[PDB]
Design an enzyme around this catalytic site. Structure first.
Site, short mmCIF file in Angstrom:
data_model
loop_
_atom_site.label_atom_id
_atom_site.label_comp_id
_atom_site.label_asym_id
_atom_site.label_seq_id
_atom_site.Cartn_x
_atom_site.Cartn_y
_atom_site.Cartn_z
N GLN A 1 46.83 35.93 20.79
CA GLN A 1 45.44 36.35 20.79
C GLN A 1 44.84 36.29 22.19
O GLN A 1 44.08 37.18 22.60
CB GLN A 1 44.64 35.51 19.81
CG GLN A 1 45.08 35.77 18.39
CD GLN A 1 44.13 35.25 17.33
OE1 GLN A 1 43.94 35.88 16.31
NE2 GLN A 1 43.55 34.08 17.57
N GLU B 1 54.61 31.63 45.28
CA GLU B 1 53.52 31.14 46.10
C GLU B 1 52.64 30.17 45.33
O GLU B 1 52.03 29.28 45.94
CB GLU B 1 52.71 32.31 46.63
CG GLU B 1 52.14 32.09 47.99
CD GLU B 1 51.55 33.34 48.56
OE1 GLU B 1 52.17 34.41 48.39
OE2 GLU B 1 50.45 33.26 49.15
#
Ligand SMILES: Nc1nc2c(ncn2[C@@H]2O[C@H](COP(=O)(O)OP(=O)(O)OP(=O)(O)O)[C@@H](O)[C@H]2O)c(=O)[nH]1
Ligand SMILES: Nc1nc2c(ncn2[C@@H]2O[C@H](COP(=O)(O)OP(=O)(O)O)[C@@H](O)[C@H]2O)c(=O)[nH]1
Ligand SMILES: O=C1c2ccccc2CCC[C@@H]1Cc1c[nH]c2cc(Cl)ccc12
Ligand SMILES: [Ca+2]
Ligand SMILES: [Ca+2]
Ligand SMILES: [Mg+2]
Ligand SMILES: [Mg+2]
Ligand SMILES: [Mg+2]
Lengths: 62, 438, 243, 420
Positions: free
Chosen positions: B15, B254
């Site tokens: 959801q 990163e």
């Protein structure tokens, strides 16, 4: 308070501002455990059918 | 360009994934039928949005997404919802019966019978990728699928893609929305089993977002739609740098380099401002200073906890809208003198900033007002351990009497996996206390 | 009808707060580890501040300030004053003995002053009118001595410096321990210990985060706590000066 | 998520018939099996209890007795022809209020035929949740044969959920003196072979009808009317769509922390032209007067609780009132199961009410009921009185000493957690 590595482009900018500097298990082992659990189930289920078979025998004996 | 695959597991995962891909489409201009007018390279590309979308010869833009629920009711609404044409049927995967709020039933019993199919549908996406970076996984800590199947998927993904990065978005369980008395059990189990397999995980406490929807959206009883539309804004900020041109957090390696000096301590706290109601008749627009300041208010964090009583290891500011670097450093300078902000010695007090000039997008007719500037802060405080202590203590209360354990054993688990998972969490709390206190 | 638990069984002051709270017929005490409480009278050490404020439909209040130990542990206090800009300071001894104290006569007797300070959830600072010098001299007595022996008062010679030192320590750590916008709230009682020198100059010695009172005062001051720190947050069906 | 319903004996079939009348009116089904409702919430989960037909709906219901009397009454009653005629399974001789005849002789002759209808109903289930049984414990068919069926079903379907609505005997409203024997034998079976049992005491049903409904001479029909309202409310979440997927296995996982302590106290409110305010529902629901098991909840501690509000109301006010009653009565919930009180809400109210609440509680006060049964049992069994009715069907005294022992253990286990 020093700025650094400033990068620009049409979408925006990015940069770094400083205030002070400083001073795996294998597929076989998964298989094993995933199956030592199924065995433990089937054992528990087999105990259940065993106790149930005894109850059938008592039912017959009565 | 390098691709990213999102995996949505369970009701919460699915959801929330609806809300995110809806928001993505609205942001990249992709309409429900998969078309993207502004994409001129018909049928291919290596633009930045292509990190999250592949393209068909017919010009359809297709989420690099896999949805997975052990029971079909939820992924069905996607199969027949406003975005049906968006997904290939084989990206939506459902079983017959769910894990009944039972970790072991999701991990050992019912999970073992659908894992190979899910890995097969994921492989089908990895083969469509020139240079796949890794995976983003959405799940609840508390559901039986969300915790148990996920930890099994995370074990096998490490095996099948040892070189790939795996990030999590994890809904932490809140009683005022929760589903089961056993969620603390499921929560600890799936943390223990997924820890070594995750690079970075963002915990969204349902309590925090629930209070935000009430206090700041004047919603008396917030719904999953409310909660999930607000959660999708925070995920969109975190992922904007993978889908848009920029130079901060451009690949999944990163996130852990910039936010995770310690491998186990890989749970950055998220804070987001501003949250403003669409039916606030009169609203004064807030400033760079005012919203950067709100980033240090606990009432705005995705997890309630007090960062003043911990230490920072990394801080990341991510702006969207009318922001220029100079307003940001005048805000930081002000804030630094008024707030307690202590970093760990072996690490530099400072900020990494990223700005995207496009202001945040809102679902037309939702509850969030459009704003001219917004920010999401990602910080690695030892303060987030407050949430592990809450969860570990609830686990200690029930497990001291072995309440509900028989449901787990009866699926094949040994009682030792509980105490193994809790000793791992007891070490995790000890790590945080190392880094954090004197 | 409000609820509260007790997790420091041998604390003279809050033993009397619990007792007076029951007697109102509007509070009942639960068991140490029952989380559905309004008010925690907590442990002196390792108090679990990270579990407060997570009970839906419960305003929660605790009688300690997380972080206040920065002021109450000698090594920390010294680091605090030496390091915090808001303190530079002229009232704290050089630290890393006051060889010329004031002496009461007759006896050539040394003494120290204990002042009692309540900080509520709004961060108001309440000094208890009654301080103490059974080898115990109170404020009415001490005042008359100073007038007779020195021609000055307790307010002018000592109390100005005391209210100044209390203000300065607690406003220093305010942004670090304030619960103004937190999900639980804190109050805490403090005990400040001063010495006076011949020049009628006040000095600070230590700050106590879990202080006891003096017998004849264990009543006025314990009631003043319920009035200002508790019933202010949990209404029902002055002895302090605000600083 | 289909559920197979089974009703056994006199009490089990009379209460089961009322239940199918009540929910059929809720789901808009008429006595002919034809839907004539005005909403689709009535039909979204209709398949949980009804099979489809001229697409009519037929209850997934098996009616079982060792004599024909009560089932002729059902077949002749309001919604009687709604039931599938193949699904009436009965013998002729009865069970004589005798557990042994139901479990060992008369019932043993009939059980396999019942399991053939059970097998037919199950095999055509897309995803079978398990089984729900309505029966009394004090007679012979529903008690003796009812627990025989439960043992056969667990053997053939060991991985489905077993759920009973079990009526407990009481000297106040009583058919025979051997009820405590029949009930002790049956509780031994139920402790091992069900996942959830709703303990409905005929004493409480009588007091509610007398001391509250102001009926001076309650009939069994007035008693069953209360059982029908509670069965309807206890299954609301299984039959209507809610923000939660409610099913029998999730209920068991969340309600039962120890496998043998799975006996629940049901309650109802209200027991009238003014609807109740949400504060009133919450007060009454948790009132001992409103509870159907004749145990004083203040004599024990709740391990778990589940409450369902029916009607259009302030969910905010609901939560506010639930949180109030916990924090006004925390001496009565265990502190070692955090957040052990769950709340559901459903917009569709039951017939004749705009506001109702149903309470399901796993309290250790239920031990009072097993103690009461044990006292009545030992009083006769220590003189071996009326035992020849059972030894004449093949039973030995030993099986009685064993069931007396297993139920005194149950009382010890419940008492172990009321003081932890
Ligand atoms: N924020 C948010 N939380 C949710 C949502 N759905 C469920 N949850 C929460 O997640 C936990 C339950 O997990 P679910 O996702 O419902 O479980 P699941 O993985 O489907 O597991 P089973 O249904 O047990 O198979 C509870 O804490 C719920 O409050 C959602 O859409 N948003
Ligand atoms: N509530 C209720 N209890 C009943 C009803 N009929 C019988 N009982 C109770 O059921 C028990 C034994 O009855 P019964 O069900 O008739 O036996 P069976 O036919 O042998 O299963 C006794 O405790 C009775 O009080 C009924 O219609 N409603
Ligand atoms: O499915 C259910 C059900 C089934 C039949 C009738 C009524 C209900 C109530 C709604 C919720 C439960 C399941 C459940 C989820 N979390 C819980 C926590 C506690 Cl203490 C108790 C139960 C549950
Ligand atoms: Ca393109
Ligand atoms: Ca015969
Ligand atoms: Mg689910
Ligand atoms: Mg001293
Ligand atoms: Mg009868």
């Amino acid at each position: 308070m020093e700025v650094i590595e400033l990068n620009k482009c049409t979408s925006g900018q990015s940069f770094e501002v400083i205030l002070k500097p400083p001073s795996d298990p294998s597929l076989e082992e998964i298989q094993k455990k995933l199956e030592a659990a199924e065995e433990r189930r089937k054992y528990q289920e087999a105990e259940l059918l065993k106790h149930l078979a005894e109850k059938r025998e008592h039912e017959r004996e009565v | 360009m390098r691709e990213c695959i999102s995996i949505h597991v369970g009701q919460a995962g699915v959801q929330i994934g609806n809300a995110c891909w809806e928001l993505y489409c609205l942001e990249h201009g992709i309409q429900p039928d998969g078309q993207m007018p502004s994409d001129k390279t018909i049928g291919g590309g290596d633009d930045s949005f292509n990190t999250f979308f592949s393209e068909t010869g017919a010009g359809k833009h297709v989420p690099r997404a896999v949805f997975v629920d052990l029971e079909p009711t939820v992924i069905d609404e996607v199969r027949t919802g406003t975005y049906r044409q968006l997904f290939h049927p084989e990206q939506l995967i459902t079983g017959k019966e769910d894990a009944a709020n039972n970790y072991a039933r999701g991990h050992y019993t019912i999970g073992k019978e659908i894992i190979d199919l899910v890995l097969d549908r994921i492989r089908k996406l990895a083969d469509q990728c020139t240079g796949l970076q890794g995976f983003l996984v959405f799940h609840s800590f508390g559901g039986g699928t969300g915790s148990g199947f996920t930890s099994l998927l995370m074990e096998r993904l490490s095996v099948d893609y040892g070189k790939k990065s795996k990030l999590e978005f994890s809904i932490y369980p809140a009683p005022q929305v929760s589903t089961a008395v056993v969620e603390p059990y499921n929560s600890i189990l799936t943390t223990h089993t997924t820890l070594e397999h995750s690079d970075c995980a963002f915990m969204v406490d349902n309590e925090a977002i629930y209070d935000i929807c009430r206090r700041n959206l004047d919603i008396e009883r917030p719904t999953y739609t409310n909660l999930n539309r607000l959660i999708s804004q925070i995920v969109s900020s975190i992922t904007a740098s993978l889908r848009f041109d920029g130079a901060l957090n451009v690949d999944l390696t990163e996130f852990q380099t910039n936010l995770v000096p310690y491998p186990r301590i890989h749970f950055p706290l998220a804070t987001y401002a501003p949250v403003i109601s669409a039916e606030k008749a009169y609203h004064e627009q807030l400033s760079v200073a005012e919203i950067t300041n709100a980033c240090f208010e606990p009432a705005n964090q995705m997890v309630k906890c007090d960062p003043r009583h911990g230490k920072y290891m990394a801080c990341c500011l991510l702006y969207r809208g009318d922001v220029v670097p100079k307003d940001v450093n005048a805000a930081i300078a002000t804030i630094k003198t008024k707030r307690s902000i202590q970093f760990v010695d072996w690490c530099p007090t400072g900020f990494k900033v990223g700005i995207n000039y496009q202001p945040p997008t809102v679902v037309p007719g939702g509850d969030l007002a459009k704003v001219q500037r917004a920010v999401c802060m990602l910080s690695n405080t030892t303060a987030i351990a407050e949430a592990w202590a809450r969860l570990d203590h609830k686990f200690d209360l029930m497990y001291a009497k072995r309440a509900f354990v028989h449901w787990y054993v009866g699926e094949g688990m040994e009682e030792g996996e509980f105490s193994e998972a809790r000793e791992d969490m007891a070490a995790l709390e000890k790590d945080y206390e190392e880094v954090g206190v004197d | 009808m409000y609820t509260f638990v007790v997790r420091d069984e041998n604390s003279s002051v809050y033993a009397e707060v619990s007792r007076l709270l029951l007697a109102t017929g509007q509070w009942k005490r639960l068991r140490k580890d029952n989380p559905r409480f309004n008010l925690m009278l907590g442990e002196r050490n390792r108090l679990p501040f990270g579990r407060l404020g997570h009970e839906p439909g419960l305003v929660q209040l605790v009688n300690y300030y997380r972080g206040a130990d920065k002021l109450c542990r000698k090594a920390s206090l010294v680091k605090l004053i030496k390091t915090s800009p808001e303190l530079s300071c002229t009232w704290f001894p050089e630290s890393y003995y006051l060889e010329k104290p004031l002496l009461l006569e007759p006896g050539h007797r040394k003494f120290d002053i204990r002042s009692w300070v309540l900080v509520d959830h709004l961060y108001n600072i309440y000094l208890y009118r009654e301080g103490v010098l059974g080898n115990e001299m109170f404020f009415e007595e001490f005042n008359q001595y100073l007038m007779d022996a020195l021609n000055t008062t307790l307010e002018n010679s000592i109390l100005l410096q005391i209210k100044h030192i209390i203000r300065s320590c607690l406003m220093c750590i305010e942004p670090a321990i304030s619960t103004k916008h937190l999900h639980y709230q804190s109050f805490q009682l403090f005990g400040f210990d001063f010495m006076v020198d011949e020049e009628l100059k006040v000095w600070l010695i230590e700050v106590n985060g879990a202080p006891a009172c003096a017998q004849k005062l264990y009543a006025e001051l314990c009631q003043g706590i319920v009035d200002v720190a508790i019933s202010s947050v949990f209404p029902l069906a002055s002895i302090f000066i605000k600083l | 998520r289909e559920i197979v319903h089974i009703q056994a004996g006199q009490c089990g079939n009379q209460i089961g018939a009322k239940f199918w009348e009540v929910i059929s009116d809720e789901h808009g089904i008429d006595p002919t099996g034809s839907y004539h409702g005005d909403s689709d919430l009535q039909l979204e989960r209709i398949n949980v209890y009804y099979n489809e037909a001229g697409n009519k709906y037929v209850p997934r219901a098996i009616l079982v007795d060792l004599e024909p009397g009560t089932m002729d009454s059902v077949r002749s009653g309001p919604f009687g022809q709604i039931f599938r005629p193949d699904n009436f399974v009965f013998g002729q001789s009865g069970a004589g209020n005798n557990w042994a005849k139901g479990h060992y002789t008369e019932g043993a002759e009939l059980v396999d035929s019942v399991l053939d209808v059970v097998r037919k109903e199950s095999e055509s289930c897309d995803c079978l949740q398990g089984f729900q049984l309505t029966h009394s414990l004090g007679g012979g068919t529903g008690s003796g044969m009812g627990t025989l069926l439960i043992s056969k079903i667990r053997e053939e379907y060991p991985d489905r959920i077993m759920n009973t609505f079990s009526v407990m005997p009481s000297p106040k409203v009583s058919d025979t003196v051997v009820e405590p024997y029949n009930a002790t034998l049956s509780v031994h079976q139920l402790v091992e072979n069900t996942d959830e049992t709703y303990c409905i005491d005929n004493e409480a049903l009588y007091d509610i009808c007398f001391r509250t409904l102001k009926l001076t001479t309650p009939t069994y029909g007035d008693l069953n009317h209360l059982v029908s309202a509670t069965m309807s409310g206890v299954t609301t979440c299984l039959r209507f769509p809610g923000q939660l997927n409610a099913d029998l296995r999730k209920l068991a996982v969340n309600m039962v922390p120890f496998p043998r302590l799975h006996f629940f106290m049901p309650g109802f409110a209200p027991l009238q032209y003014r609807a109740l305010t949400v504060p009133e529902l919450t007060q009454q629901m948790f009132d001992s007067k409103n509870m159907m098991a004749a145990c004083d909840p203040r004599h024990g501690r709740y391990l778990t609780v589940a409450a369902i509000f029916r009607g259009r109301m302030s969910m905010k006010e609901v939560d506010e009132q639930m949180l109030n009653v916990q924090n006004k009565n925390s001496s009565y919930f265990v502190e070692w199961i955090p957040n052990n009180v769950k709340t559901a809400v459903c917009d569709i109210p039951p017939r004749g009410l705009k506001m109702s609440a149903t309470f399901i509680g796993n309290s250790t006060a239920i031990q009072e009921l097993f103690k009461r049964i044990s006292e009545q049992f030992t009083a006769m069994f220590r003189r071996k009185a009326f035992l020849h009715w059972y030894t004449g069907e093949g039973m030995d005294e030993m099986e009685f000493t064993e069931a007396e022992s297993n139920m005194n253990d149950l009382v010890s286990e419940y008492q172990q957690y009321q003081d932890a």
